[PDB]
Amino acid sequence: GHLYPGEVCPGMDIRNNLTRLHELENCSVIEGHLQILLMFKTRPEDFRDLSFPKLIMITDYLLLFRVYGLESLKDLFPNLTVIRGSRLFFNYALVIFEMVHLKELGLYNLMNITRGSVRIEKNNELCYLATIDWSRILDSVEDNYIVLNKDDNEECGDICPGTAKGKTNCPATVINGQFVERCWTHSHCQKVCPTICSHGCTAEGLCCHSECLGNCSQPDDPTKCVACRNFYLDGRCVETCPPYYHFQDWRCVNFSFCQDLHHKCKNSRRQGCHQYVIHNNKCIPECSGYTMNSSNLLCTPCLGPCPKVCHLLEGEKTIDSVTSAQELRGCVINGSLIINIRGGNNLAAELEANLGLIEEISGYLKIRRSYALVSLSFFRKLRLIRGETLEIGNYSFYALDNQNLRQLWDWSKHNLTITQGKLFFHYNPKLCLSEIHKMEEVSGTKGRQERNDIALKNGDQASCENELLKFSYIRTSFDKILLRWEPYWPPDFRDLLGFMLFYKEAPYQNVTEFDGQDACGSNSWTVVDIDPPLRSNDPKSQNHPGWLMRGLKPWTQYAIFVKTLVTFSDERRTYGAKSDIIYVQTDATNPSVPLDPISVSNSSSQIILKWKPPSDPNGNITHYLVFWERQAEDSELFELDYCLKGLKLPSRTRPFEKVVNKESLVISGLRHFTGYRIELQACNQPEERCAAYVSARTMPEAKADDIVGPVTHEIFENNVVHLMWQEPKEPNGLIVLYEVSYRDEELHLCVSRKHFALERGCRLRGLSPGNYSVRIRATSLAGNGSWTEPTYFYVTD
Amino acid sequence: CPKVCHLLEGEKTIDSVTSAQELRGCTVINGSLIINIRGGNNLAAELEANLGLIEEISGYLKIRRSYALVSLSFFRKLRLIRGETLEIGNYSFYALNQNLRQLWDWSKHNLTITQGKLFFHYNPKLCLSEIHKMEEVSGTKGRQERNLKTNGDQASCENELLKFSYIRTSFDKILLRWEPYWPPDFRDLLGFMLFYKEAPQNVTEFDGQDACGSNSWTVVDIDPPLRSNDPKSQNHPGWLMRGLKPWTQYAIFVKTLVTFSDERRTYGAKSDIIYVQTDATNPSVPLDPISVSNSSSQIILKWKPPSDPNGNITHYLVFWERQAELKELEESSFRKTFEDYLHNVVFVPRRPFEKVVNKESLVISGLRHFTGYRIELQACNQDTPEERCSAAYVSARTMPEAKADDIVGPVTHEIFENNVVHLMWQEPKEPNGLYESYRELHLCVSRKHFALEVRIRATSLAGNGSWTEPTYFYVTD
Amino acid sequence: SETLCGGELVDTLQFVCGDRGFYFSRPRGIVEECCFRSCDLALLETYCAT
Amino acid sequence: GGELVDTLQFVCGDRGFIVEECCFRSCDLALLET
Amino acid sequence: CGGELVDTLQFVCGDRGFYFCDLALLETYCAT
């Protein structure tokens, strides 16, 4: 036909040389698996001129293992499109294992894997794996398992064509934050269908017919598909089989077809054939409840029970994968089942679909090392474990080291019964003893000798608390919490060993409840052990228990749930009690001192000051206050005369109001050669439930003083020349000196700081006739300039 | 020294830190203890600092559901107890401990027990073989008292040891190479992990450890060697430590990380503890020199002992220059299981310088009166003529006498034609480093004018020099 | 001979069979024989097609 | 020290009103109320 | 990187010569 041109052939196994590989030449669909492996002495040249373009689908799975020599599948299966995964190879529908010389994966026409996962592993030279978007290929992307390929290290490089060359024509794809174009080889880019279309798409992106799967030659045609969703019939894909019967869940067949299979299997007891029968408009190899079949191929409902018992080879079956589980579809088990599902991936859905119909087990049930097996509920209809064959020690149920086993059954809904054997439970961390005791009750074991081997101290690292504790009273200091939960005792208060109170810092109302974990201080609850309350008489007299936790940081939030501690015993119950996860926060208190007071002479008007928040605000830091004290100048500075021998030349180096979150401040108005005491504090709150210290000078005069004044002379007589000077007031006025020169290189004099002020005192004396000059250095603390004009006069003595 | 200690009711339920200080320095306790610690941090050292001094205890000793106590090595000083019927079943020592690993180094000290049984239940990480030594070395061995599937069940009685085939050392790197070890099937060995610690020589595995995570040992991981094709010649595992302290003793040992097995579980291996010295290297830090002048010809300085001795510190060298003005296990086991499953189905049968010897100080001999100096300090750890030394810098100057600076010599005013005069003057000789009076009245003279030709102070670099007494003379009319 | 678990099993068993192919015909495991137990040449040859 | 007064005041509250018990030993609320 | 690439190379295989992150990796660089 126009959809599938070639034949359909059963599963193949190509081994030890590629000579037998001449079977895929004419097949388009394989009703089985395709295994190509163990052909060491083959070389790439052998695969240089071998291809299989007509193959388009593999129903079960594809496996390749140590096929030496071939470098890529891009020339071997150019047209493979769909792997339905009806029967899987250990959860996997595509497997590539230890392909020594394989370099890139090819298979650019693969566009849907209906069931199972993919496992490409230990290919020492394989790359072009990160360049594949599995989310589009598998309708579910998790559970994939690709590791130890060359791409994992060695910085293997892949070069997707088109988009990287500016030619586009290579779809970009999604990564959590690093979108990238994706491809199978350096010359084949993966197809991506527009979301509106699992159905196929054309070259330009038009949607194919709703029944087509993967690809189609022209859009919106029931025919011309490449692969069919649901069922295929004579060149078109149909939603369901028209009256023809469904066969192998992928195609339609007539009555004669199934009749031939029935006759052939009857005529040949090959142990590879099935007495195919018809049932519920389907052609199937084994039709419970309809076991009998007449001379027709149609099975009919039974009169009386007809369970379709399933007999186990050697009497023990290990359910280690979906492949093992799937082998029991539709099954009463005439043996014992061992469940050994390792690995982190969870497959409870598949187990229920395959094993959910089992109603009884003849032998024992053993569950060992099942890691990600959360619950046994997937045995949706198991109701009897006869125990005719027992695990050594006479155990009927045997659970050991189930890291995540949590619930056996919904005992409110379920029923169970075991006619013999004991019960064994060991090292199951998260299985609470309450469930085990319920099973003891609802399994008939309590109805006889009992003496089951339930290892107390199961349930560790899990919370099995079945009662509440209520905080009857609380107090909130800024460093302490009073806490008084209501009293509680088991039926016999001697079982009460005390209270264990848990707490940690929790700045948010969302926190995970206790589950049983370590005690490292980085994240774990801090635990304080509390002795039991006194037992005197009825509660009306006996006070409630309580605690006083102490040493807390103020104003922060904590979760302070409490739980009881009791002695364990098979004889006794009331496994414990646990309060809620209530939040409380200690009261706030006055903040700490502000940090890092800094000063700078930025602007001549005022000091500019910066600070840092208090080390511990002890509250929601909201408010700051600053004092700027305008200190007066020191005492001796107004009178001390520095003209004295040895005495050095001197040098130096309410308006208050609060401030908003801004952590810097500037003020208006100040002197020059100035800068004074600052003290400031912070507030987390008119109550003013709130000083750091810093003193700093600011700019000097910031201009040149060079103060003008009565610089003129007046010659009354020799030594009476009447030279005067006036006080500088704009700066702080702490005049260090006035330079007096009698210019002979300006022979100089110093001026007394206040004897001059008495009445122009300390004037120069004893002048000679002729020109004389002077420029007065009315010197401030800095005194960089301060010189007047070098005025000169002709002395006439 | 003896500190007899007694308590109300005799029994104290010690906690992590609080209530630990009470027994500080106590001994021959007239009481009992419960030591119920299940949290905290830095428990080993703190408990040592408070309880590390007990030598004997009366009554009985109980350790109950303590979580973070990996071992009672911090109890090591305990070496006797006045055993008496102070516990149910006449018990004397009572343990009942999630992470307990060992009690004490049984090769080091004995322990005397007056009487009574012993209790050991639910101690998952304490090896049962370790309990056997507790039987032998304690005074309760066998005949006198009675004391298996509740302790050590999660431990591993490693019964093979790894030799360190090849060891080489360097200035900051040690190279190790131990003999290879493979379980019955090589896939189980996830790899080696190496422990090392600076040991200035008696440390043991468990010292300084608690479940809270304060382990002193530094730990690194080494993957297995690339397995050799030839079964009888393989690649010796190895590792190369880096960033180490020179001349420093390091204690190291290795432990295999082998995966579990449902049937007979293969046991790991541990090498012994070995100590290796990093090689010596030249020191490089005569740090923090401090200097001051004792006198004009006496210069004194100190310096800090090197922070990087890098070898037994030998003489110092000083020079002066006159510059004058579980998930992983499951992952690996799942890979192994899938590989085994694949194999199970696809195969079917048919210059002035000194050499200071000891002290970090020196007073250099008499030298120029006031000049500064540039000083070099170098440390060494080899007195051999092939010495190794590698120079801190600090500057200092000698203080001035300030008396030789004064002229104490010729000064007078030469008199000449009317209003012509000049003050001759003598430059100080060998001074400790301008000049300025008359009427007072002031002036300054400097280097420039001394080539041209009343009091004077005659010192610039130091002030308040002796003011020469005035020279009086008549007007120059 | 001891054990041959893992890739060693394939490497060694290939050497035993040589040019002969591994016998297969679709309708305990070999690992149960030569990984969890001691293995000898007399048994490996049964996995080659004579 | 002063912590004893501060805490014990908290316990008593409105009610009106040892070192060998709650200073040199561990202290619990059950005893302070006395 | 840095001086390591020469100093460790000398230390580990100085007696084998060189040809070109851990002992097992860089013991290969020497020309034994």
What are the sequence ranges of the domains in chain C?
7-47
**Pairwise CA distance, residues A304 & A229, whole Å:** 39
Say if the Cβ atoms of B338 and A645 lie within 8 Å.
Answer: no
Do B301 and B379 belong together in one domain?
yes
Q: Smallest Cβ distance to C22: which of A11, A15, A98? A: A15
Question: C-alpha distances in angstroms, A714 versus A496, A505, A794, A796, B450?
Answer: 110, 85, 12, 11, 38
Q: Is B226 buried (19+), middle (13-18) or exposed (0-12) by CB count in 10 A?
A: exposed
| Alpha carbons A349 and A372: distance in angstroms, whole number | 13
Residue A335 has what DSSP assignment? S
The torsion defined by the Cα of B305, B308, B312 and B317, in degrees rounded to 10, comes to: -60
> Residue B80 is encoded by which pair of tokens?
């006797």
A22 secondary structure, DSSP code: T
To the nearest whole angstrom, how far is the Cα of B318 from the nearest Cα of chain D?
A: 57
Residue A713, by phi and psi: left (phi above 0), alpha (psi -120 to 50) or beta? beta
A90 and B341 in contact by Cβ < 8 A?
A: yes
Q: DSSP for A700-765, please give it.
A: --SS------------SBTTB---------SS-----EE-EE---TT-EE---TTHHHHTT-S---
Instruction: For residue A455, give the chain B residue with the closest CA.
Output: B150
B298, B425: one domain:
no
Phi, psi of C6 (to 5 degrees): 80, -155
Cross-strand partners of A418? A385
* β-pairing verdict for B218-222 and B164-168: unpaired
Structure tokens at A367: 């569950």
Can you name the residues that pair with A7 across neighbouring β-strands?
A27
In DSSP terms, A772 is beta-bridged to A793
Q: Do A343 and B327 touch (CB under 8 A)?
A: no
Contact B190, B258 (CB under 8 A): yes
User: Of A93, A143, A92, A153, nearest to A122 (Cα)?
Assistant: A153
Dist. CA A723–CA A730, nearest whole Å: 22
| Strand stretches in B181-259, DSSP E | 189-198, 218-222, 239-241, 249-258
Residue A559 falls within a domain, yes or no?
A: yes
Task: Say which amino acid occupies B78.
Answer: L
Cα separation, B236 vs B180, in Å, equals 6
Question: How far is B279 from B249, CA to CA, in rounded Å?
Answer: 10
- Distance from the Cα of B209 to chain A's closest Cα (Å) equals 13
Question: How far apart (Å, rounded) are the C-alpha atoms in residues B92 and A357?
Answer: 58
Specify the pairing of strand A145-147 against strand A180-181: unpaired
- Which pairing describes strands A112-113 and A82-83: parallel, antiparallel, or unpaired? parallel
To the nearest whole Å, the CA of A593 is away from the closest chain D CA by 23
Name the residue type at position B420: V
Chain B residues near residue C8 by CB distance under 8 angstroms: 186
Query: A527 - beta bridge partners?
Result: A502
CB-closest option in A475, A531, A543 to D28: A531
What's the Rg (C-alpha) of chain B?
A: 40
Give the residue from chain B lying closest to C33, CA to CA: B344
Nearest CA of chain E to the CA of B204: how many Å?
27
Q: If you search the block for the tokens 């390591």, which residue do you land on?
A: E4
Kindly tell me the sign of the dihedral angle through the C-alpha atoms of A236, A237, A239, A240. positive
Q: What residues does A692 pair with on adjacent strands?
A: A680
Amino acid at A139: D
Q: For tokens 């009178």, what's the residue?
A: A639
CA–CA separation, B38 and B69 (whole Å): 8
Separation in Å, CA B442 to CA A305, A627, B424, B438, B458: 135, 47, 17, 7, 13
Q: Which of B68, B122, B333 sits opposite A519 (nearest CB)?
A: B68
The total of structural domains in chain B comes to 4
Of B263, B340, B349, the CB nearest to C23: B349
Enumerate residues 1 to 32 of chain E having a beta carbon within 8 A of any beta carbon in chain B.
Answer: 4, 8, 11-12, 22-24, 27
Bridge partners, A368 (sequence order): A400
**Beta-carbon separation of D28 and A475 below 8 A:** no
| A619 contacts A588 by C-beta, under 8 angstroms | yes
Q: Which residue has the tokens 């322990």?
A: B111
Q: Is A637 in contact with A664 (CB distance < 8 Å)?
A: no
Report the C-alpha gap between A236 and B214 in whole angstroms. 70
Q: How far apart are CA B362 and CA B383, in angstroms?
A: 19
Does chain E reach chain A with at least 3 CB pairs under 8 Å? no
Are residues A283 and A252 in contact, defined by beta-carbon separation less than 8 angstroms? no
Right CATH number for C7-47 from 3.20.20.80, 3.90.1150.10, 3.40.50.620, 1.10.100.10? 1.10.100.10
Do A16 and A162 lie in one domain? The reply is yes
How much is the CA Rg of chain E, to the nearest whole Å? Answer: 8
Question: Residue A671 and residue A690: Cα distance in Å, rounded?
Answer: 31
- How is chain E split among helix, strand and coil, in percent rounded to 5? 45, 5, 50
Kind and range of the H or E element at B50?
helix B43-51
Which of A768-780 are b and which e, b meaning 16 or more Cβ less than 10 Å from the residue's Cβ? eeeebebbbbbbb
Looking at residue A789, its amino acid is E
* Measured distance CA(A237)–CA(A226) in Å, rounded: 10
Token pair 């007589």: residue: A717
Cα A600 vs. chain centroid, distance in angstroms? 46
- Nearest chain A CA: its distance from B49 CA (Å): 21
Q: 3-state DSSP call for residue A51?
A: coil
Is CATH 3.40.50.2000 what the domain over E1-32 is classified as, yes or no?
no
Q: What is the number of helices (H) and of strands (E) in chain D?
A: 3, 0
**Nearest CA among B427, B424, B429 for reference residue B411:** B424
> What resolution in angstrom units was achieved for this structure?
3.4
Strand A557-559 relative to strand A496-505: parallel, antiparallel, unpaired?
antiparallel
Question: Which one of B240, B244, B254, B281 makes the best mutation probe of the E interface by having the most chain E beta carbons within 10 Å?
Answer: B240
SS (H, E, C) B217-228: CEEEEECCCCCC
Amino acid of residue A91: N
In whole angstroms, what is the distance from residue A752 CA to residue A735 CA?
A: 10
- Asked if B454 and B386 sit in the same domain, the reply is no
Contact A172, A180 (CB under 8 A): yes
Q: Which of A15, A17, A272 sits opposite C27 (nearest CB)?
A: A272
Residue B211, domain CATH: 2.60.40.10
Cα dist. A496→A257, A515, B64, B87, B89 in Å? 74, 21, 16, 20, 22
User: Which residues does B contribute to its contact with D (CB < 8 Å)?
Assistant: 8, 13, 15, 18-19, 22
The answer to whether position A497 is within a domain reads yes
CA distance A379 to A359: 8
Please tell me the distance from the alpha carbon of residue A165 to that of residue A168, in angstroms, as a whole number: 7
Give chain C's end-to-end CA distance (angstroms, integer): 23
- The dihedrals phi and psi of A496, each to the nearest 5 degrees, come to -75, 115
Measured between CA atoms, how close is B177 to chain C, in angstroms?
25
Task: Please check whether residue A279 lies inside any domain of the structure.
Answer: no
Cβ proximity of B93 and B118 under 8 Å: yes
DSSP codes, A86-98: SS-BTTEEEEEE-
The pair phi, psi for residue A740, each rounded to 5°, is: -115, 120
Chain E partners (3+ C-beta pairs within 8 A): B
CB < 8 Å to A587, chain D: none
* Dist. CA B404–CA B391, nearest whole Å: 35
Q: Are C8 and C40 in contact (CB under 8 A)?
A: no
Q: Which two tokens stand for residue A161?
A: 């064509």
The candidate with the shortest Cα–Cα distance to B43, out of B215, B193, B198, is B215
Assess whether B28 and B90 both reside in one domain: yes
Beta-strand runs (E) in A200-345: 212-216, 225-228, 231-233, 236-238, 245-247, 251-253, 277-279, 282-284, 316-319, 336-339
Whether A402 and A431 have beta carbons less than 8 Å apart is answered as: yes
Q: What is the DSSP code (8-state) at residue A304?
A: S
Considering CB atoms only, which of B187, B347, B348 is closest to C6? B187
Residues A416/A409, Cβ–Cβ less than 8 Å: yes
User: Cβ of D7 and A550 within 8 Å?
Assistant: yes
The CA distance from C19 to the nearest CA of chain B, in Å, is 16
Q: Are B100 and B66 in contact (CB under 8 A)?
A: yes
Do the Cβ atoms of A342 and B330 come within 8 Å?
Answer: yes
In a domain, residue A475? The reply is yes
Place of tokens 């504090």: A681
What's the N-to-C CA distance of chain D in angstroms?
Answer: 19
- Helix/strand/coil for E32: coil
Residue whose tokens read 């049962």: B128
Alpha-carbon distance of A59 to C26, in angstroms, equals 17
E strands, A327-433, in order = 336-339, 360-361, 365-368, 384-385, 395-400, 422-426
Q: Nearest CB to B39: which of A35, A342, A519?
A: A519
Is the separation of the CB atoms in B95 and B123 below 8 Å?
yes
Structure tokens at A711: 């610089």
Residue in C7, C10, C27 nearest the CB of A271: C27
Cα–Cα distance for residue pair B445/A336, rounded to 1 Å: 119
Residue B174 shares a structural domain with residue B261: yes
Q: Using a CB-CB distance cutoff of 8 angstroms, which residues of chain B are in contact with residue E24?
A: 222-223, 225-226, 235, 237-238
Q: Helical H runs in B160-205?
A: none
Q: Is B112 helix (H, G, I), strand (E, B) or coil?
A: strand
Residues B75, B78: Cα–Cα separation, whole Å: 6
For residue A590, give the DSSP letter.
Answer: -
Q: How far is CA B235 from CA B179, B181, B221, in A?
A: 9, 11, 17
**Which residues constitute the domain of residue A524?**
471-585
To the nearest whole Å, the CA of C40 is away from the closest chain B CA by 14
Structure tokens at B365: 């001999």
Closest CA to A737 of A661, A668, A640, A607: A640
Neighbours of B195 (CB within 10 A): 19
Burial group, residue A373, by CB count within 10 angstroms (0-12, 13-18, 19+): buried
Gap between the Cα atoms of A499 and A734, Å rounded: 75
Q: Which of A368, A566, A550 is nearest to A465 (CA)?
A: A566
Residues B379 and B461 in one domain: no
Which chains reach chain A with 3 or more Cβ–Cβ distances below 8 angstroms? B, C, D
How many CA atoms lie less than 13 Å away from A213 in the CB half-sphere? 25
**Phi-psi map region of A566: left, alpha, beta (phi>0 left; psi -120 to 50 alpha):** beta
Cβ-Cβ contacts under 8 Å, D26 against chain B: 13, 15, 18-19
C-alpha distance from residue B380 to each of B243, B277, B286, B358, C10 (Å)? 22, 19, 10, 12, 62
Tokens of A15: 């081994």
Number of CB atoms found within 10 A of residue B152's CB: 20
- The residue type of B415 is I
Considering only CB atoms, E8 lies closest to which of B237, B239, B240, namely: B240
Q: What's the start-to-end Cα distance of chain A, in Å?
A: 140
Give CA separation, A42 vs A46, B77, C36, in Å: 6, 72, 32
DSSP state of B306: P
Give the list of residues 6+ apart from residue B121 with CB closer than 8 angstroms, or none.
B95, B96, B150, B151
- For B417-420, the CB contacts below 8 A with 24+ separation are B418/B476, B418/B477, B419/B476, B420/B476
